[PDB]
Ligand binder design. Structure first.
Ligand SMILES: CCCC[C@H](CC(=O)NO)c1nc(Cc2ccc(C(=O)OC)cc2)no1
Ligand SMILES: [Zn+2]
Ligand SMILES: [Zn+2]
Ligand SMILES: [Zn+2]
Ligand SMILES: [Zn+2]
Ligand SMILES: [Zn+2]
Ligand SMILES: [Zn+2]
Ligand SMILES: [Zn+2]
Ligand SMILES: [Zn+2]
Length: 203
């Protein structure tokens, strides 16, 4: 099975492990994980975070042929489980000084879900892309501006967290994957750049 290939100690996730648009697994509702986690599910989580780290590292991205990412969901690896990894880096200042915090968000989340959210919507100005989508897709992907999420970490500890800004957008994108929803499902069908009054456009 896919899981067996992915969790081998020496195996590094790369683009050849990422399934593409059209594969039915991307449209399923992923299965909840049970705790305590199996070794496979723990290792998968670690491999997913490793992939994100590598995708953001100039050398390793080059060695492995990686498209840069800030999030990854198990369904994109053909594993229909409610597991996501998110890694959103902070940026250097104009003087080249590293940020105080390397990441605004770094987590492997099991059974994550949105439990509440703002009435206000938001969308990235530049739209969204997807590791599984090898097409140009224009338009505002309309999401909740702010969300409260619950999730479990690999230990089974429950977390409750409010998110805004880019963190909110990233987590929503990944949670959509484990519900079988694709980013373009949330782009206006008639005018991709339509703006409903009050939409928060994030630069
Ligand atoms: C807004 C989140 C978009 C994340 C994607 C990667 C992806 O497909 N994640 O599921 C990606 N595109 C650019 N960076 O990551
Ligand atoms: Zn591989
Ligand atoms: Zn079930
Ligand atoms: Zn471990
Ligand atoms: Zn490494
Ligand atoms: Zn709601
Ligand atoms: Zn929602
Ligand atoms: Zn609750
Ligand atoms: Zn459409």
């Amino acid at each position: 099975a896919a899981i067996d290939k992915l969790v081998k100690a020496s195996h590094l996730i790369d683009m050849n492990d990422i399934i593409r648009e059209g594969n039915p697994t991307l449209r399923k509702v992923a299965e909840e994980v049970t705790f305590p986690l199996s070794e496979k599910e723990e290792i998968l989580g670690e491999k997913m975070m490793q992939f994100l780290k590598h995708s953001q590292d100039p050398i390793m991205a080059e060695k492995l042929g990686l498209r840069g990412g800030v999030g990854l969901a198990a369904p994109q690896l053909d594993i229909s489980k409610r597991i996501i990894a998110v890694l959103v880096p902070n940026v250097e200042d104009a003087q080249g000084n590293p940020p105080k915090e390397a990441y605004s968000l770094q987590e492997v989340m099991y059974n994550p879900k949105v439990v509440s959210h703002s009435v206000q919507d938001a969308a990235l100005s530049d739209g969204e892309g997807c590791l599984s989508v090898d097409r140009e897709v224009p338009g505002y992907v309309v999401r909740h501006a702010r969300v409260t999420i619950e999730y479990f970490d690999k230990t089974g500890e429950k977390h409750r967290l409010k998110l805004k800004g880019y963190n909110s957008i990233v987590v929503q994108h990944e949670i959509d994957h484990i519900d079988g929803i694709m980013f373009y499902d949330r782009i206006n069908e008639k005018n991709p750049f339509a703006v409903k009054e009050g939409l928060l456009i994030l630069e």
